[PDB]
Amino acid sequence: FDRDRLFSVVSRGVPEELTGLLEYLRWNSKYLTDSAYTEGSTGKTCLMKAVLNLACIMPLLQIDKDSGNPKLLVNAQCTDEFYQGHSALHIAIEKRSLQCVKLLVENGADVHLRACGRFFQKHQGTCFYFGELPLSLAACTKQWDVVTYLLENPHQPASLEATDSLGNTVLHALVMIADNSPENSALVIHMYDGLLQMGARLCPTVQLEEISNHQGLTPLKLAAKEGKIEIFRHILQREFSGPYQPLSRKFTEWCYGPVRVSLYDLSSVDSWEKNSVLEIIAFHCKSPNRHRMVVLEPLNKLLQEKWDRLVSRFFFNFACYLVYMFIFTVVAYHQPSMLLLGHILILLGGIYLLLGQLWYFWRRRLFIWISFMDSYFEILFLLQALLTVLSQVLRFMETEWYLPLLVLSLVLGWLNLLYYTRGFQHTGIYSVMIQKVILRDLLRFLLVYLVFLFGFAVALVSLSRRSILDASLELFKFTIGMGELAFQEQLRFRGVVLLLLLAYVLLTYVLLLNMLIALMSETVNHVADNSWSIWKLQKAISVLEMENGYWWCRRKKHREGRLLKVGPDERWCFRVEEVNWAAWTLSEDPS
């Protein structure tokens, strides 16, 4: 009859130790859901503790029936902001107790309760996100029996299209819990396939895969953005038997011996529609394993024709820039007849690149921030175009300082030509994690080298006593292999200066060689990719932007694929041909 006594009895699980409790509630006109009988700190109730210490449950729910409780404790919600929304039904699912779930559900437990507590959010610290619904909890915990019961119970079925606070459905929840681990991949893939099959039986008129959350992403799109390659590949290459044939995404058109042709569904993948998978992977994805996404069987083939169909435009862009840079060099060399025409093209060329580059940053601004190394050449083209236009502005507004900026724009313009080198093989090492590491060390090495160069130069000046600029330049000549080593006999500390100069020679050789050894270890501890995943990602990024068209002339995008009636249902599929000599259809004859 006491709050402390009630919680102690339910822990033991003996209903005989709790007698007259119902009579006590009637005498005091109090309910089990009242704040007096809750834990207070988090709103935890007697039922919640009973499920935690897993029979007393049935009498405890039975004595709710005697008292005139208007609110059912079976649907009680926690009040603490950390653990808000968690209910007794969630405990039974978490404890993997099918019998407790059946007992709870049969007594009017709500299956759509939202666990919107801070612990259930996608935090960076302690947390666990399984949608926000009891149905999602069972799906993410390998409980097919609980999922089956929650989907096929006459008391209160749980809807598969229910959404969390973020709009995530059950399929979305499986995506957010993926971790590309071999144990986790089997968990998500098996449950995702099972839910789809059960979804057709329960709700055949509702298409689960087209439901989008508050961000407007389908479960297939969500996997691409979040970087879950394991579930992404399974969804992208999915096939089923006859009963679940319309639920598949990969189909066989015809099979003539070893030759087999497959049709992949380009529903949300092809870049004809906005916010496609290709656009999401290349630009809206921040996961490190972005390159491994495009090497998938349907994506690898599809991106090839787009590159092949638009390879001429890529070289046309290269030719236009190469000719423009040649014009820039000639005008600059003779800057001090046709030279008047040349300056017009420089101003027009600079303003053309500037406006075109300004479009790119207007369409997308987060992409440069999230992945600087992916589109760092976009920044470089902006500086070259802005400075070229600014340099010609200083020519009209004569300030006699346009030449240093024009010369600086000339050398950087040729550097931007290295961007087009991504259209070829170029061997090297292809990695993004390594490149950031290598770039960081070289900049740090330069800072270390400069301070040592500056530190020794001041030491040389004071001991020998031009200034620091001449002395530092003399020391820097040692790297270019042009240093001066001589015993200056007209110095008081001639030996000390000579020994100090020799110390710098031995010091700089170690520093340069250490960077070479440090750079050598990265090459040795690098595994080459036979599919050239990094190179394909760069090509995929370029073709997606290039197919959008220039700023001055937008180009209509033609959908890639063929409309085929799978059977009815018509999907724009992609033809892929494969040869298999070990395994021994939609159409009737090969074509």
Q: Which of residues 36, 339, 348, 415 is near ligand POV by CB under 6 A? A: 415
Closest contact distance (angstroms) between CB of 295 and a second copy is 14
**Among 320, 330, 439, 473, which residue sits at the site for ligand P0T (rule: CB under 6 A)?**
439
Binding segment (CB under 6 A) for ligand P0T, from list 193-201, 210-218, 258-266, 433-441:
433-441
Binding status of residue 416 toward ligand P0T by CB under 6 A: no
The secondary structure element, H or E, covering residue 256 is: strand 250-256
Is there binding between residue 428 and ligand POV (CB under 6 A)?
A: yes
Q: Does 544 bind a second copy (CB under 8 A)?
A: yes
List binders of ligand P0T among 541-580 (CB under 6 A): none
* Shortest Cβ 416–ligand POV spacing (Å): 8
Contact track, ligand P0T, 358-397, x by CB under 6 A: ------------------x---------------------
Both tokens of residue 184?
């986790």
CB-nearer residue toward a second copy: 270 or 374: 270
- Out of 274, 365, 426, 554, which residue is the one contacting ligand POV (CB under 6 A)? 426
Q: Judged by CB under 6 A, does residue 445 bind ligand P0T?
A: yes
Tell me if 422 contacts ligand POV by CB under 6 A: yes
Q: Which stretch binds ligand POV (CB under 6 A): 129-137, 297-305, 388-396, 420-428?
A: 420-428
Q: Which is nearer to ligand P0T, 426 or 556 (CB)?
A: 426
Query: How far is the C-alpha of 506 from the C-alpha of 493, rounded, in Å?
Result: 20
Find all residues with CB under 8 Å of 58, minimum gap 6, and list them: 103
| 180 sits near a second copy (criterion: CB under 8 A) | no
**Token pair 């709700």 in the structure block, residue:** 203
Pick one of a second copy, ligand P0T, ligand POV, none as the site partner of residue 578 (Cβ within 5 to 8 A by kind).
a second copy
User: For the purposes of burial, counting CB atoms within 10 Å of the CB of 142, is it exposed (0-12), middle (13-18) or buried (19 or more)?
Assistant: middle
The single residue among 203, 366, 446, 499 that binds ligand P0T, judged by CB under 6 A, is: 446
Nearer to ligand POV, 62 or 421 (CB): 421
Q: Which residues contact 344 (CB under 8 A, 6 or more apart)?
A: none
Locate 465 and state its tokens. 């006593």
Candidate list 75, 245, 435, 587; residue touching ligand P0T; CB under 6 A: 435
Whole-angstrom Cα distance, residue 209 to residue 189? 14
Does 515 engage in binding with ligand P0T (CB under 6 A)?
Answer: yes
| Per-residue buried b or exposed e for 560-586, using 16+ beta carbons within 10 Å of the residue's own CB | bbeebeeeeeebbbbebeeeeeeeeee
* CA nearest to 311, candidates 417, 427, 426, 422: 422
| Residue entry with tokens 């779930």 | 101
Q: Which residue is nearest to ligand POV (CB)?
A: 428
- For the window 49-88, what string marks contact with a second copy as x by the rule CB under 8 A? x--x-----------------------------xx-----
Q: Which is nearer to ligand POV, 323 or 418 (CB)?
A: 418
Q: How far is the CB of 376 from ligand POV (least distance, A)?
A: 7
Q: Which does residue 493 bind out of ligand POV, ligand P0T, a second copy, none, counting CB within 5 to 8 angstroms by kind?
A: none
Q: Distance between CA atoms of 586 and 127, rounded to whole angstroms?
A: 47
Closest CA to 432 of 518, 365, 375, 374: 374
Q: What amino acid occupies position 578?
A: E
Which residue among 318, 445, 454, 572 contacts a second copy (CB under 8 A)?
572
Determine the interface stretch with a second copy among 22-30, 153-161, 510-518, 569-577 (rule: CB under 8 A): 569-577
Contacted by 415, from ligand POV, ligand P0T, a second copy, none: CB < 5 to 8 Å by type = ligand POV
- One of 202, 310, 380, 500 touching ligand POV (CB under 6 A): 380
What's the farthest any 2 CA atoms get from each other in the chain? 112
> What's the min distance (Å) between Cβ of 406 and a second copy?
50
The per-residue DSSP string of 315-344 comes to HHHHHHHHHHHHHHHHHHHT---THHHHHH
CB 576 within 8 A of CB 298: yes
Size of the site for a second copy (CB under 8 A): 83
Lookup: tokens for 40: 């207070």
Question: In which residue are the tokens 């046709």 written?
Answer: 338
User: Which of these, 67, 71, 194, 102, lies nearest to 140 by C-alpha position?
Assistant: 194
DSSP state for residue 128 in the 8-state scheme: -
Q: Does 128 bind a second copy (CB under 8 A)?
A: yes
- The answer to whether 255 contacts a second copy (rule: CB under 8 A) is yes
DSSP 206: S
Q: Which amino acid is at 173?
A: A
Give whichever of 1 and 532 is closer to ligand POV, judged by the CB atom.
Answer: 532
Residue 411 found at the interface with ligand POV (CB under 6 A): no
- Please return the burial class of 264, using the count of CB atoms within 10 Å of its CB with bins 0-12, 13-18 and 19+: buried
In angstroms, the CA 12 to CA 14 distance is: 6
Say whether 131 sits in a helix, a strand or coil: coil
Q: In terms of Cα–Cα distance, which of 363, 285, 271 is closest to 551?
A: 363
Nearer to ligand P0T, 322 or 439 (CB): 439
* Residues engaged in binding ligand P0T (CB under 6 A): 376, 428-429, 434-435, 438-439, 442-443, 445-446, 449, 479, 512, 515, 519
* Residues engaged in binding ligand POV (CB under 6 A): 380, 415, 418, 421-422, 426-430
